[PDB]
Amino acid sequence: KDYKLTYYTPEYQTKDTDILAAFRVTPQPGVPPEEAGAAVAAESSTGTWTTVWTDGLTSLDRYKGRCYRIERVVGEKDQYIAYVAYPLDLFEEGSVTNMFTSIVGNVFGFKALRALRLEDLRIPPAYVKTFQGPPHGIQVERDKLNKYGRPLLGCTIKPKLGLSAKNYGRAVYECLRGGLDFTKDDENVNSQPFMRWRDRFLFCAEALYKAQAETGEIKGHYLNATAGTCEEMIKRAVFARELGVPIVMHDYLTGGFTANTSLAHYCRDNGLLLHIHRAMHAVIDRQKNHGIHFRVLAKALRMSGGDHIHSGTVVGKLEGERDITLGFVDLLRDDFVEQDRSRGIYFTQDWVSLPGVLPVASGGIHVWHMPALTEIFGDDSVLQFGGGTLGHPWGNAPGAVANRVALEACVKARNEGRDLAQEGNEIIREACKWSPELAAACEVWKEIVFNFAAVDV
Amino acid sequence: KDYKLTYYTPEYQTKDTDILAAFRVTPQPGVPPEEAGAAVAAESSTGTWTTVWTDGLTSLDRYKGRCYRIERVVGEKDQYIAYVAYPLDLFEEGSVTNMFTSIVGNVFGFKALRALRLEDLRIPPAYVKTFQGPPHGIQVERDKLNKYGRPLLGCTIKPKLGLSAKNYGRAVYECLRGGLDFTKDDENVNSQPFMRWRDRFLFCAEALYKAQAETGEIKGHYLNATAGTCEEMIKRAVFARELGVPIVMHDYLTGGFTANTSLAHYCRDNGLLLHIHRAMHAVIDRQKNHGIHFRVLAKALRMSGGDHIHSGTVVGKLEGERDITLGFVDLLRDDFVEQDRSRGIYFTQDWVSLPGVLPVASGGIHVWHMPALTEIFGDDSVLQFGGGTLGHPWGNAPGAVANRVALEACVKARNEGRDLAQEGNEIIREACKWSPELAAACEVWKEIVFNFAAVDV
Amino acid sequence: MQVWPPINKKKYETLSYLPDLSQEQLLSEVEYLLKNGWVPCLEFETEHGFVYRENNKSPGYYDGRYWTMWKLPMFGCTDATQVLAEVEEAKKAYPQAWIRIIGFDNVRQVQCISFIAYKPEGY
Amino acid sequence: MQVWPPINKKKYETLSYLPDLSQEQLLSEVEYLLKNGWVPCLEFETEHGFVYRENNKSPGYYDGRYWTMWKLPMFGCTDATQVLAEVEEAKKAYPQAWIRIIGFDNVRQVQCISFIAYKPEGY
């Protein structure tokens, strides 16, 4: 089957309504780039080795994917970037499920290729308008919560699996009362023998309302609605609505796009914020040669629907990887993101006012990382801590206070014109003076970085 | 029909997925034990005297019950214990109704037997997982009610049948305000000319909320939802949910397992605690030679669903009978109960985290019985009084206070290292000094046991 | 015949119907926790000393069940006096607060003890 | 080890966990707004200083989010002292009121700043 002479069209001028795809192709030895890129386009559209009579009862050239360009990858050899264009008509309106089925449904198993990786997708404005997108989005969320001028703060309740409903609520209250905005249900925590969902929702609501009453600030707890069936999932969200809480949670990849879109629609119709966890993403997005890059999985979530989405951590990453992260963070928050291959952005993406998603940074984050995080992500982000709150010597509340004080010290310093990049450690040092909670959290750090301590007067 | 050569299989090695049954068989004269035990297994599974053509369109040896062991009873002669094994496939998932139909459906009427009694059943983990079990269970219940470190206290409103809705509520308020946690609808009290259900639910809710507001402790009243049809039963529970009360009640044996499982499911989905009354049990479980022992009826309730279950009284029982009671109490509360023939436990029962049920002790219980009850049952129990509260000289509230003071005196003494078994009477004596209510309840008792009275200073 | 008071008789669950525990009795209770291997912990409350229902009235929901934790659960504690010391420190900092001692069991992720240790003036 | 107070620690969002801003620091914050092209505006409240839920309890609904505007947004304001002057005038007229400075962004129809500038006695 010589696809090259039908699916490889370098003269093709892409239309405003086309869905464009950037594939990183690693063809089998002997297989030319043009033929590999044509095999990719062919398999993900009409998929024909030759011709059958039914192909005459329509126009093949109307519904075919077209490889219009090939580019050799600067680094490794035997690796190319194939650009494919898909007609708007191939896709069902409002269905991320159909978009993924058409583009990544069968091509990754083609024999002529050794490895295949979808790097990016250009979602045209005409297809974007068929999606509801985030239930609320960054702006509406800040307005509902009445929180402005700083990153939001959250913490994970540990251990992951194991705690009872009442103990879970206790940790929720202690963390929230200390200065945190949100607490989190573990992604694995749904409904189990040690803790059934309804009891958890009930005690967590009691805990979050107490902390809100005590502090005077609006609180929220991501109540996991992920379930075995769509009916159970909705049944769980319905109870969150009855309790009057602000936010629910969902594991979009393990739950699935069909179920996630249903929940997102429900959340829009009922005023619930939707926190998304990316569990299982690394089985798909880790290897550089095979799979789907997270930036595509992030675009899919923004279309399907979610107000927050876990987007990893930037701590301990080479600029390089950091640039890739900032690349997809922009794709999630901004309305218009211009093409920029240096940050892994293969296409200019126009979101035509689709609400932006709040990126959630988590993973080994400590108070002394606050300066760098505040500078890198900016205000529109949610910074989540695990052992930085639970692992504080004095407990949850003092641990939450330490993180809240550290963050506000960074915000104040930034606003006063200080460079968070070079004065970071000093900013935390000064803050330790007026915060016993922050000081106790910085002990081991002071000994290594400052070779001491202390205070003076 | 010679079952013995097909249903009596002493070489059979039981599987982890088998439902095991321990039958106490009293065969007709002349009928051998092996043949009797094989008749029991045959009748409660495939039930064939000989063979018909349809038996070849399947494998008889795949769905047959097997008597794998016989044991002569030490005491009486002509009495044996037959052990039968049933394949997991014979049973419908989540249906206690089907389990009872298959095992006890026809065998008790077999002619070759003079009497038959089901003593125990080994419910394998694979079948246990198909049941929801108690709506909440011991732990969640204590957490919802915020009650720890002592047995719970309840009282019955008397007379059984006869009082009006408002008078019923009055007794409810007086008892609850005095220190009791729960009050009880009589098992016979459903909806009658003298008192319709809705009026009772309405006045009892008013009474329990007043007592809760007055005392500062969470109160509950078992509102009987037992009814003629499933629709009426649910309709009654729905109103309890609208009133926001914590607990409802059901007579599982007269109402039935199909209806009880429906109510239990409803209670889980709506956060209602379910109190179970064992009315009619003695027509089934009293005779040692024929029927079903309560330990099996208790296992069935824990599977079908219930948070509390009446399990009789231990007062005035020989160790012997007391050991049998502690045997089924463990089967109701614990996760793993090892085999122990001395306490009537024929099989090791693994409950694989199915919630435990709170045993309810009632029947001629007086304040001076408190020491023995607290020691025998422990904290995880509900102690119910009838005339010990209503029959108090000063009325309901002072009667409730006497029982609450007596119980707390026993708990304190136990915690301080005192032996409730030998110091019981003295503990109540000391308590009478600081409680006029307790003193008045102990008058006739003081005269007999202590040959007096009084106080000193 | 006496009438049980409908006012000024607010309770705090287990042991609250007995006369106020003397320091010696309070100490014996803590030793029961330790002897059983239970982890002691202190909780206190300054505003709502009793349950109420402001945010929801569905079955099983009540506000005021959770109190605020005093420091952290005392793991590895072997001396019951260490626990008694914290109660003194707590009422020293918050004299107008209700203080209670709770116990946690690990075989069971549960709480299995809860008794009042200090009550504010007029309670 | 210290216990975080369950009372008298009411907050007002951004910057409220830091020591009360000195007039100099308060002025630096206003200059951040101006440097970014944000329109400053003052809001004050005399009765409900914190959110509550009286009219509805559905998801996302809270009473007390809106405060009353002090005059008008300060468009074209180039001097941060003009803003600081208004805070003095506001607390002069309403000493028992909480006063906060908010900032508005135009590229985005949004508010993007909100910090407390004055708190009444005992707060």
From Swiss-Prot, chains A, B:
UniProt-listed Enzyme Commission number(s): 4.1.1.39
CDD domains registered for this protein in UniProt: RuBisCO_large_I
Organism in which the protein naturally occurs: Nicotiana tabacum (Common tobacco)
GO molecular function, one term: ribulose-bisphosphate carboxylase activity
Miscellaneous comment as given in the Swiss-Prot or TrEMBL entry: The basic functional RuBisCO is composed of a large chain homodimer in a 'head-to-tail' conformation. In form I RuBisCO this homodimer is arranged in a barrel-like tetramer with the small subunits forming a tetrameric 'cap' on each end of the 'barrel'.
Domain of life according to the entry: Eukaryota
GO cellular component terms attached to this protein's record: chloroplast
Active site: 158 (proton acceptor), 277 (proton acceptor)
Binding note for cofactor: Binds 1 Mg(2+) ion per subunit.
Annotated keywords: Acetylation, Calvin cycle, Carbon dioxide fixation, Chloroplast, Disulfide bond, Lyase, Magnesium, Metal-binding, Methylation, Monooxygenase, Oxidoreductase, Photorespiration, Photosynthesis, Plastid
Predominant localisation class: plastid
GO biological process, one term: photorespiration
Site (Transition state stabilizer): 317
Lineage, uppermost ranks: Eukaryota, Viridiplantae, Streptophyta, Embryophyta, Tracheophyta
Binding site for Mg(2+): 184, 186-187
Catalytic activity from the UniProt record: 2 (2R)-3-phosphoglycerate + 2 H(+) = D-ribulose 1,5-bisphosphate + CO2 + H2O; D-ribulose 1,5-bisphosphate + O2 = 2-phosphoglycolate + (2R)-3-phosphoglycerate + 2 H(+)
Binding-site residues, substrate: 106, 156, 160, 278, 310, 362
UniProt signal peptide: none
Broad enzyme group: lyase
Modified positions (N6-carboxylysine) in chain numbering: 184
Cofactors (names): Mg(2+)
Subunit description: Heterohexadecamer of 8 large chains and 8 small chains; disulfide-linked. The disulfide link is formed within the large subunit homodimers.
Family to which the UniProt record says this protein belongs: Belongs to the RuBisCO large chain family. Type I subfamily.
Location(s), subcellular: Plastid, Chloroplast
InterPro entries: RuBisCO, RuBisCo_large_chain_AS, RuBisCO_lsu_C, RuBisCO_lsu_C_sf, RuBisCO_lsu_fd_N, RuBisCO_lsu_N_sf, RuBisCO_lsuI
Name recorded for this polypeptide: Ribulose bisphosphate carboxylase large chain
Modification(s) after translation: The disulfide bond which can form between Cys-230 in the large chain dimeric partners within the hexadecamer appears to be associated with oxidative stress and protein turnover. The disulfide bonds reported in 3RUB and 4RUB may be the result of oxidation during crystallization.
Function, in words: RuBisCO catalyzes two reactions: the carboxylation of D-ribulose 1,5-bisphosphate, the primary event in carbon dioxide fixation, as well as the oxidative fragmentation of the pentose substrate in the photorespiration process. Both reactions occur simultaneously and in competition at the same active site.
Swiss-Prot record, chains C, D:
Locations listed in the record: Plastid, Chloroplast; Cell junction, Plasmodesma
GO biological process, one term: photorespiration
Gene Ontology cellular component list: chloroplast; plasmodesma
UniProt entry keywords in alphabetical sequence: Antiviral defense, Calvin cycle, Carbon dioxide fixation, Cell junction, Chloroplast, Photorespiration, Photosynthesis, Plastid, Transit peptide
One Gene Ontology MF term: ribulose-bisphosphate carboxylase activity
Domain of life: Eukaryota
Main location: plastid
Family: Belongs to the RuBisCO small chain family.
Role played: RuBisCO catalyzes two reactions: the carboxylation of D-ribulose 1,5-bisphosphate, the primary event in carbon dioxide fixation, as well as the oxidative fragmentation of the pentose substrate. Both reactions occur simultaneously and in competition at the same active site. Involved in antiviral defenses.
Assembly and interaction partners: Heterohexadecamer of 8 large and 8 small subunits. (Microbial infection) Binds to tobamovirus movement protein; this interaction seems required for viral systemic movement.
Protein name according to UniProt: Ribulose bisphosphate carboxylase small subunit, chloroplastic
Organism (species): Nicotiana tabacum (Common tobacco)
Gene: RBCS
Interval of the full protein contained in this chain: 58 to 180 of 180
